[PDB]
Amino acid sequence: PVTIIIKECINLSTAMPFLSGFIQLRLMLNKLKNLDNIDSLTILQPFLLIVSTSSISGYITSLALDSLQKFFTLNIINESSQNYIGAHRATVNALTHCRFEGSQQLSDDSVLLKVVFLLRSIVDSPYGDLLSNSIIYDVLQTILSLACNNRRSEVLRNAAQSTMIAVTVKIFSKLKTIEPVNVNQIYINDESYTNDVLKADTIGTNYADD
Amino acid sequence: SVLLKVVFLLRSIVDSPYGDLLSNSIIYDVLQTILSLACNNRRSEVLRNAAQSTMIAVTVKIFSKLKLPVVRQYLNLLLSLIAPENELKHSYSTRIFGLELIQTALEISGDRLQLYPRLFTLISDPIFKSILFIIQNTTKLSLLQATLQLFTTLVVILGNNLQLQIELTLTRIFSILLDPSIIKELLIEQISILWTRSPSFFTSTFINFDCNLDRADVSINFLKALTKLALPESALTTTESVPPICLEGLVSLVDDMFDHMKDIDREEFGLKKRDRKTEFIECTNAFNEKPKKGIPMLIEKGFIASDSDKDIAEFLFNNNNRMNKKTIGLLLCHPDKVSLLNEYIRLFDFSGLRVDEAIRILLTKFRLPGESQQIERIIEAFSSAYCENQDYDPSKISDNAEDDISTVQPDADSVFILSYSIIMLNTDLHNPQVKEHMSFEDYSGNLKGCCNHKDFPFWYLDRIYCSIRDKEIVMNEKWFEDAWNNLISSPLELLNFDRAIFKQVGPSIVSTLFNIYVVASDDHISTRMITSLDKCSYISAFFDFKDLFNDILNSIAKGTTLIMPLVIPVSTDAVRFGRSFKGQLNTVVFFRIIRRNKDPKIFSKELWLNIVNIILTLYEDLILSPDIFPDLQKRLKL
């Protein structure tokens, strides 16, 4: 379990500054034997800083995002890990603010699907139930922006449609567990219909926190 | 888009709980298609990335159930994917994708794989061939990275029982490392996790790998490679990042052995396997030499009952992997041990065995000697041994029985010419230097009138030729082996155990510690370097190691640089102290060693001559105060 964090820190260290957290982590990770009191927000923080930052190239972001997918799919972040809900809040919040830069190898359109798949895995998993309203709203805004935009390829749009039809199930299934508020008193509508609007695209080349 | 849709439907149906109720044959029919989607390159790249993600997910789902024919067929499919037999048809991308796939599949549930035998049989012989073969025969960096990814996972999770197969792989890395420019950097960078993760990997290796008789020595070899890699001269054949990894390995080793050192009593201390292994590995060097003087040396070690030729002949008989074969062949070639020549081959058994299998077995016993006249006696005893082993029945000789050994009753000349003719087949056919191909019919006709002035049974020679033709060679060092190059087909206690590490390796380690501290200019590396040297100095005190515990402080004393007119205490050899940070740093740790030392007798004569200096010269440059014992001064009223 402790292996898989230092492991792939080998892989993502190979990027020849912004990488200093990785060698700091490698010095931190040698003698633990387990994930007990390591402040689990910090152990994912260098990856979050890599994916959130816009200046650096896209290839390192692709490698980091694949590493993050491999992180979650193992289920290394156990429930017993300290402050895990904060870590998942941080990684979703950093995911929704993703940025990109032009690159010759691969394509940004190729690796946006990794963001979509990782978001789908995050929300669909039980871990997604311990998320706040603002970050999930930002996630839905980002996915809807990806779906609506015509600049990207139609296959990625189809992936966006698929994950949205997937995530309606998860968001509305909690509607069964929740109980009705108030005492069924008479209600007068006084809220707007068009106060909100579709957020403009940002991932590409160029009573809420409860 | 329809391919993406069917992939999403497959992921949803297989990840669902109802996916567990799919049949244990249809999953393979699924997997062939949805993995061929990943392998195919002409499709869009985003579709391939979707294929990689959903293969990772379905691999999690299928291998989580292992806690059943589907996984067997699956490992067969990955074996066909990764292994180099099908390298021509498959591309780099599909191969590496399968490689990280099997890495994930083993890593998720590798602990439980020991119990079930069929998967382990499929993972030992054919799978490990792939990761062994890729290291010598690759150029692209990503594939080597992925293979070392998988190999490090095997060592870190499944290194306990998967024991012998660690040997042949692990040596070969040094053959490419100790002996390509970026490949060495990749190897060193990816191997460090091996020592880092497992907490006491070197001690565990010395426990199971070294002191066991059958296995060779790797940990001592590992340190002997690393210490050579430590010096900056290795930067002429490696990148600047390589020495930091090796220094991290060495400092981690000494820090782990110091973390083992927290609370043990020295008086409480005052091997049961390696004690044999010492003289056992010593006698091979005498046998890998002019070995006449080593034979009476062997008897003195309480190994053999008596100096009779039967006992030494039996001794050379049993062991096959130990003695160097060419040296034993040359020993057998000498003409002054003809008694040993007669009696050693007597203990062979040719009952119910053919001559072809006899020669096939016997060529493995020694390399065929390249001498002209010395082989004439052995290639003759080859024939002469066979007369008494097979009991003679002259009244039961006939050609009616086909594929029969009892029918032939050759004399000495018959088996002599048979053996002399059989040896020529490998040079005639298998060797490539003979460009003119010789027909076998002329070779058989050459043997006219040989079976006691008569022809040998032609069916016998025909079957022997049919046997030997099966191993034709085209175009010798090890060019790999179809049979795996292995015979698989055929707190006080731990300190006591690793007591023997330093007596083998320690001088090399302290030499490694020095010669980089001097050249290194940076403060941060140097303070850690000298702290490591302090750790070795403490470790020397528990044990005896007089040479090490003398030489290390002698080197430090020479390194402190203490051995115009003066006036505050200015001196010719005080400004050198102030200007040199290193001179400041060695004195404090040196006098710390002198402080916490326990035994008085351990120091030597010339060290004592050294430490009367330092303090005398510091007096002579008026640095330290003179009244070191004011109590005796007050007692004398002086």
Residue numbers in the entry:
A (entry chain A): 11 to 26, 71 to 260, 322 to 325
B (entry chain B): 164 to 230, 329 to 440, 455 to 545, 554 to 758, 765 to 779, 799 to 871, 889 to 892, 903 to 973
Any passages from the paper?
The budding yeast homologs of GBF1, named Gea1 and Gea2, localize to early and medial Golgi compartments where Arf1 activation orchestrates the formation of COPI vesicles destined for the ER and earlier Golgi compartments. Here we present cryoelectron microscopy (cryoEM) structures of full-length Gea2, the yeast paralog of the human Arf-GEF GBF1, that reveal the organization of these regulatory domains and explain how Gea2 binds to the Golgi membrane surface. Gea2 and its paralogs possess an N-terminal DCB-HUS regulatory domain and C-terminal HDS1, HDS2, and HDS3 regulatory domains. The HDS1, −2, and −3 domains form an extended helical repeat structure that is contiguous with the DCB-HUS domain, such that the HDS3 domains of each monomer lie at the distal ends of the homodimer.
Three-dimensional classification of the particles revealed three distinct conformations of Gea2 homodimers that differed only in the positioning of the GEF domain, with each monomer adopting either a “closed” or “open” position relative to the regulatory domains. Based on the relative numbers of particle images that sorted into each of these three classes (~30% “closed/closed,” ~30% “open/open,” and ~40% “closed/open”), the conformation adopted by each monomer within the dimer appears to be largely independent of that of its binding partner. We begin our description of the structure using the “closed/open” dimer, as it exhibits both the closed and open states of the GEF domain. Unexpectedly, the GEF domain of Gea2 adopts two conformational states. The GEF domain lies adjacent to the HUS domain and is connected to the HUS and HDS1 domains through ordered linker regions. The conserved GEF-HDS1 linker adopts distinct conformations when in the closed, open, and Arf1-bound states and therefore appears important for stabilizing each of these states. Given the apparent independence of each GEF domain in the dimer, it is also possible that only one GEF domain is able to adopt the open conformation at a time when Gea2 is bound to the membrane. This possibility would enable the Gea2 dimer to remain more closely associated with the membrane surface throughout the activation reaction.
